[PDB]
Amino acid sequence: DTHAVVVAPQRLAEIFNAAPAFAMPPIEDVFYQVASLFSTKP
Amino acid sequence: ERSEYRRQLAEYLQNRMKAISPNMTELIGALVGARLIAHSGSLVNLAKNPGSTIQILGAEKALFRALKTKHATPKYGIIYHASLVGQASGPNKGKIARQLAAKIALSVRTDAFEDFPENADDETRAAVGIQARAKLENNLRLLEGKPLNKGVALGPNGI
Amino acid sequence: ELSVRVPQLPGPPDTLSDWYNIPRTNLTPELKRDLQLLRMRDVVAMGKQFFKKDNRKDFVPEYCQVGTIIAGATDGVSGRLTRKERKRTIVEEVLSSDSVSKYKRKYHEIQEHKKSGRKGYYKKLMAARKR
Amino acid sequence: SSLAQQLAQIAANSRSSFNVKALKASHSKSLIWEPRVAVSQTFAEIYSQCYEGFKELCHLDSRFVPFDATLFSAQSQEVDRTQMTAEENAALDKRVDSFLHLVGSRLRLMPAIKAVEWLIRRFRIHEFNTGTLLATFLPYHTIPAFVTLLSILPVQRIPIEYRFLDPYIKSLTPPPRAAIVQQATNRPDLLSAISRYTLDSCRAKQEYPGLISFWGGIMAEAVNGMIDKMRSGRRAIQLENDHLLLQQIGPVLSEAMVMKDVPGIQIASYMVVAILAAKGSLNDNILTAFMEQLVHGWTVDTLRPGLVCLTMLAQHRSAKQLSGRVAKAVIKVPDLVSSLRDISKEHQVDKLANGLVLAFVDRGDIRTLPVINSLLLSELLQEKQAKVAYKALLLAAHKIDNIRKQVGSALVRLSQAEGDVGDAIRTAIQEVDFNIEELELKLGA
Amino acid sequence: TLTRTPSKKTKFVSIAFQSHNIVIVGCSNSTICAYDVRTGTMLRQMTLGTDLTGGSKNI
Amino acid sequence: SAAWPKAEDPALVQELLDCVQQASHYRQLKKGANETTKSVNRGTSELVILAADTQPLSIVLHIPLICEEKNVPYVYVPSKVALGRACGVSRAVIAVSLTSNEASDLNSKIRALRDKVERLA
Amino acid sequence: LGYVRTMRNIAAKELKELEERYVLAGPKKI
Amino acid sequence: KVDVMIVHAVALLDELDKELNVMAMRVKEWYGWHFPELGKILPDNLSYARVVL
Amino acid sequence: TMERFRVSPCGRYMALVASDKKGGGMLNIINVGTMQWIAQARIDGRHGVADFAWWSDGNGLTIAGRDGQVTEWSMITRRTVGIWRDEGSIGGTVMALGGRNGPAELGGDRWVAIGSNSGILNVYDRNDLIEIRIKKYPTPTRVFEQLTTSISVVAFSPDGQLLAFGSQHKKDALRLVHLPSCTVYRNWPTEQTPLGRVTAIAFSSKSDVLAVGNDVGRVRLWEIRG
């Protein structure tokens, strides 16, 4: 059985702050980064 | 002819500082690294210096006058004309100056004492410099993206 | 060809535009001693050369700049200070000059005249009465 | 000073200039030219330079011809906004909003800034349409163009949700993303304004990756911060906070998940749903509702990120089996077990696989048989889940009243699986205590 | 010299070898040290409590 | 490796860390590589303890050079985290340097401890 | 503290120089 | 690698900088007698030398 | 003295720490139903045995002794299975050991918490403890540096989900950690939660009630619902 993962807003904000809105990697790569951050795999 | 000789001398100096200490070159640049090597005398004599000393290399006159008069000491030396502190302004410039001095001390110790099996790329030799540069730039962009103070938005009446 | 502007919208004047931008006085204590000397130069050249008595309330001007005479191309063997006399401040030049013994002598004369009968004289008289 | 208060209300709501100094200042406020020439700059040369810029814009992209007809015309040289009636002003607001949504993509170019300089210096967008203009300049919140727009904006026309730019107008520095997301997680007004703006743009099919990435990032960090606010421990308060979050978000995520035509905004919505499911602890019905709309909404361009979000949803559910239409759409997925192995390389797909197996077992069609067999031989379930799955499969084979032939072929195929899942099937048969020889003979004879 | 114990009052009173490279020394501060000969290191330090029969608290 | 005056005996490591904790309470201590460097250069450092678990060893290998030039004893303890929460920092210190004064029980302990370090050498 | 540190550094260099010069001026051998 | 090359090279670079400055201003005052509007228009000293060439 | 002792969850054995320090501490194991000495386990340290705990199936016991050493010593072969070291703890003070579904050869207790005297509490995973061989320098699943002073009391939930650890020397040093996430609960204790100087803590058998008793001598109760 699983539980709700915990994440640090510093890490998430660093991921989204690494580039401006324009000239960021596309939304697919950004989504895989976010899902990998939130993935509950040991 | 003198100007072309200066330009090719600077290219030689960049090549030579890259050959000697790739960590400091990946950190700040061959020119300011050469200035630090000059003011210290030798690479080992620089590696013997701590981080605060590398911060205030070059500002010795103002430093010792301020210390002997109980004034406030200068914040930085040649690290100013280094590149990475040039993006900041004021207090963030001072904080980047401290952090760059400490990481420069780390990188110069690594470049002057680590041993390598000589079939080693310049990249895996300057890994410490590359990692320190990326981390320090992240700290700088964070200090630049620090938000200002929130204020009460008053309407037309004063409410 | 036509770029976006950058908005740079955020007392006494800094530079006198009508006098080719002389800076405001950075009132270092060395400058304050120099200005005391320049208001006091009737006493420095002790008696040998008097000056027009210019005495205002504040002796610091609002605009100054410390300088040095460079050179006269017509006079360069006696109209030129040696290296061992080129002092940084005017008051350093004055102390390196002569007659400092003369200043000290006159100062001791004034000190005797002012301690003439003030309190040491009265202590002396009181001891001579009580003895 | 009640009279002074009512009068200041009138003075802030007033729109036209009425003395010469107010006219000169309101005409001097400009983007490109400095104010010293912007005072003495008349409308002919303004229209000449900015019409040249708009011409360059029309040679960039095609759909600027209606605004060539109606906003950049030789009569719009002369037309004054404050002398038209309220409905003419409303139609003008619609045309301005359409042009702003259209020009939002290429704002970093001097042609687009020239066009916006025309709109500001003639139609006074910075005094009459501050909401849409400020939302359109919002995604570019680092560039000096946004710094100048922040300068020329009048302080009292800024609406309430954007009223957090007051210290930056005081000190003209571009506000950082930390400030934007912090105001987003406090006020729901700014968040709803950004989401309304971007959904309007995506309905008008004038979106672009910069705006979509901005909206996704701001709402993602905003939902993170808002859940970090909503977590309160007392059961009633966290239930009310969950309902409040869902009522504040639900329409935005619904339209952004069902919107087919823009896979950018659909993937951004999937990111928001993934964070909202993994971090915030929701309920089973809300999670199955998210799955139902997601499988109703994906396409081929978003299939694999959609499966990532489905994996995280099924992982963070509480129950074990899935609801129906999700099973139908994942039947329709072409390469399921290969994709799930690709995801399981980093994401622990076990609960999703188990839910699919139980749903297909409860489905009495037999066109699911290759998917059921591939899922069981996939080694993507846990061994207990595989055992109870085979048990329920045999229970359905008993429940059935052809079908028996197909399930017999599948059952003997699973019984003669080779690996650890074959070990699990054998011990499951041994623990349920039925005869593999009885089923083999009844299905073979 | 392989090593020396940190305390100067540590006196070595017995020695026997476990294998080709591991030496077991018995030490008068109630100690049995297991050193390794090749690098001259200290594998471990077995110890014993006080003697509770009389005084002289070191075994 | 290059960590040749290594302190491996656990009783020796325990004595060194107890002495470091005591001197830290007396503020007779300098924590960190740069403050160790400054104290050794100014010649006030009575004894200096390094950590062997630094991942680049070169960031601390310079200290024995000036230590040999100034004739002050240096000794490597294993764990930088152990040295850290012995100092009382909750950060991993890698080089601590504890000085002397006119008279203290810690001064006598420092004399005995550098005697033990000389034994280790 | 900084000022006292600088004065102590100066005094330490002078003490080293003076002890050296004093020793140079003025069962040992077997 | 030996860094006495680094020390001597950066000292030579500083000496060369001051020497380049004084020779460039000298060619400025030594050609401006024939053409001073050039010195007014071109501030970059290497470009000054190239245009005199 | 017979002060510190622990009873096995099997209830057959009970362990007493001897008062014989001399750089190495031993503890005697006594059969309970007859109250007879049956065995003696001895570890090497600097002052002896800080704390210890039986295993969940009750065959071996884990002794955390000062100078950071930890010995797992079984009952079946009645000698030491293994020895490791807490990462840089300058001296252990208390330990606890709980959870389910761990290493079946090491007793099946999944989580082990060791609180030093610096205030640092390391939480190790006992499947990660295995390289029967034991890794000499295991890495903690998480290091806690929340509390400032010396860790006094540690207790796991009997359901292996909660971990309460508290320091006494400061007014109100108590924290609550969920497992296996290893995150400190941030909404309790608040600045006005009347703990006191937390001297003893205890979870109920069904893990519904947390009981805290302070040095003034009062006991307080919190239900623990999710």
PDB file of N, CA, C and O in Angstrom, chain B residues 6 16 19 32 52 80-81 85 92 108 135:
ATOM      1  N   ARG B   6      49.691  41.248 -28.678  1.00  0.00           N
ATOM      2  CA  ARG B   6      48.918  41.153 -27.443  1.00  0.00           C
ATOM      3  C   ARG B   6      47.785  40.151 -27.563  1.00  0.00           C
ATOM      4  O   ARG B   6      47.534  39.385 -26.628  1.00  0.00           O
ATOM      5  N   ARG B  16      47.461  28.281 -21.653  1.00  0.00           N
ATOM      6  CA  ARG B  16      48.346  27.830 -20.590  1.00  0.00           C
ATOM      7  C   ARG B  16      47.613  27.693 -19.266  1.00  0.00           C
ATOM      8  O   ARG B  16      47.862  26.739 -18.520  1.00  0.00           O
ATOM      9  N   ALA B  19      45.749  24.620 -19.360  1.00  0.00           N
ATOM     10  CA  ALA B  19      46.597  23.457 -19.159  1.00  0.00           C
ATOM     11  C   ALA B  19      46.926  23.269 -17.687  1.00  0.00           C
ATOM     12  O   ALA B  19      46.953  22.138 -17.191  1.00  0.00           O
ATOM     13  N   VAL B  32      41.624  36.285 -14.930  1.00  0.00           N
ATOM     14  CA  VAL B  32      41.621  36.563 -13.502  1.00  0.00           C
ATOM     15  C   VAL B  32      42.356  35.474 -12.743  1.00  0.00           C
ATOM     16  O   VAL B  32      42.988  35.744 -11.713  1.00  0.00           O
ATOM     17  N   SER B  52      38.876  33.505   2.247  1.00  0.00           N
ATOM     18  CA  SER B  52      38.781  34.942   2.456  1.00  0.00           C
ATOM     19  C   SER B  52      39.988  35.667   1.885  1.00  0.00           C
ATOM     20  O   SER B  52      39.856  36.776   1.349  1.00  0.00           O
ATOM     21  N   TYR B  80      36.227  40.802  -8.479  1.00  0.00           N
ATOM     22  CA  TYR B  80      35.272  41.711  -9.084  1.00  0.00           C
ATOM     23  C   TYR B  80      35.336  41.665 -10.592  1.00  0.00           C
ATOM     24  O   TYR B  80      34.309  41.467 -11.243  1.00  0.00           O
ATOM     25  N   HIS B  81      36.521  41.851 -11.170  1.00  0.00           N
ATOM     26  CA  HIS B  81      36.693  41.782 -12.610  1.00  0.00           C
ATOM     27  C   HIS B  81      36.613  40.354 -13.124  1.00  0.00           C
ATOM     28  O   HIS B  81      36.658  40.140 -14.338  1.00  0.00           O
ATOM     29  N   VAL B  85      30.564  37.436 -10.855  1.00  0.00           N
ATOM     30  CA  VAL B  85      30.031  38.434  -9.938  1.00  0.00           C
ATOM     31  C   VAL B  85      29.504  39.648 -10.692  1.00  0.00           C
ATOM     32  O   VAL B  85      28.769  40.462 -10.114  1.00  0.00           O
ATOM     33  N   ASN B  92      23.780  41.369  -3.247  1.00  0.00           N
ATOM     34  CA  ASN B  92      23.956  40.104  -3.938  1.00  0.00           C
ATOM     35  C   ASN B  92      25.331  39.995  -4.572  1.00  0.00           C
ATOM     36  O   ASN B  92      25.878  38.891  -4.655  1.00  0.00           O
ATOM     37  N   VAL B 108      41.092  25.532  -6.623  1.00  0.00           N
ATOM     38  CA  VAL B 108      42.528  25.665  -6.792  1.00  0.00           C
ATOM     39  C   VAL B 108      43.249  24.595  -5.992  1.00  0.00           C
ATOM     40  O   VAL B 108      44.286  24.084  -6.428  1.00  0.00           O
ATOM     41  N   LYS B 135      26.318  25.232  -9.763  1.00  0.00           N
ATOM     42  CA  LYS B 135      25.667  25.452  -8.477  1.00  0.00           C
ATOM     43  C   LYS B 135      25.703  26.923  -8.084  1.00  0.00           C
ATOM     44  O   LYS B 135      24.712  27.475  -7.581  1.00  0.00           O
TER      45      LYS B 135
END
